[PDB]
């Protein structure tokens, strides 16, 4: 099952929602995570050209696809496939980003 | 401000999440429309026809957009502008509907 993030638009888009197959895949119970930006999940061998397009993107409200190293919460590393797509309303306005982690 | 609702994929699409705003226009609680389909918000005077449109749309997983005649929870119709999309995995598999909407009964 692919795990699912939404966040606010705005002010540093803190995590509002995640599904079931998130927190098996992260290792991340919701509360850990709701009210946090999604960074925490990346770490010290987490490749900076990738997080750059990640941060060009949101800024932008772009959709954008990225394969992600990322970090369990027992620490191990994984292959995160992460999709981000704009949630906006037909006055062009940004009211959520929703993140979706393509992992097996 | 904009609602947002987030459904689940299958299962006549229960309502898993909604932001704030989606209280602020319909005034239902979370704790009122968690594990719900959407529909509860449609009455006597929905258009059939365009209600017709959504659940085609969501059959075929295609995104719409419709102007729908809707109810907050004290009976108050108010006119929904509606967007539905599905949220799709890189398999191509369905993982979500999210719908965004703007009370726009005003003129
Ligand atoms: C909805 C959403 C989901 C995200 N999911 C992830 C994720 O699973 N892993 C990750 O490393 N970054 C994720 N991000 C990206 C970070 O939250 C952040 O936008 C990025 O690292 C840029 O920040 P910087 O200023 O530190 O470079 C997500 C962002 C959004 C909006
Ligand atoms: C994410 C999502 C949000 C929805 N939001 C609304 C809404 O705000 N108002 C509404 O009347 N119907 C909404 N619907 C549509 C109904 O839930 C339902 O799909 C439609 O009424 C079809 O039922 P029928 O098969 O009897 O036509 C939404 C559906 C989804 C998947």
Redesign the interface.
Known sequence: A?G?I?TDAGADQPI??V?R?FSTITGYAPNEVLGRNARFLQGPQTDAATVARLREAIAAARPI?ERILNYRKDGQPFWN?L?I?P?????G?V??F?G?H?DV
């Open positions: 692919s699912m939404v509002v929602f599904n197959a696809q496939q999709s797509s949630v906006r309303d037909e006055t306005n009211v959520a929703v979706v393509t």
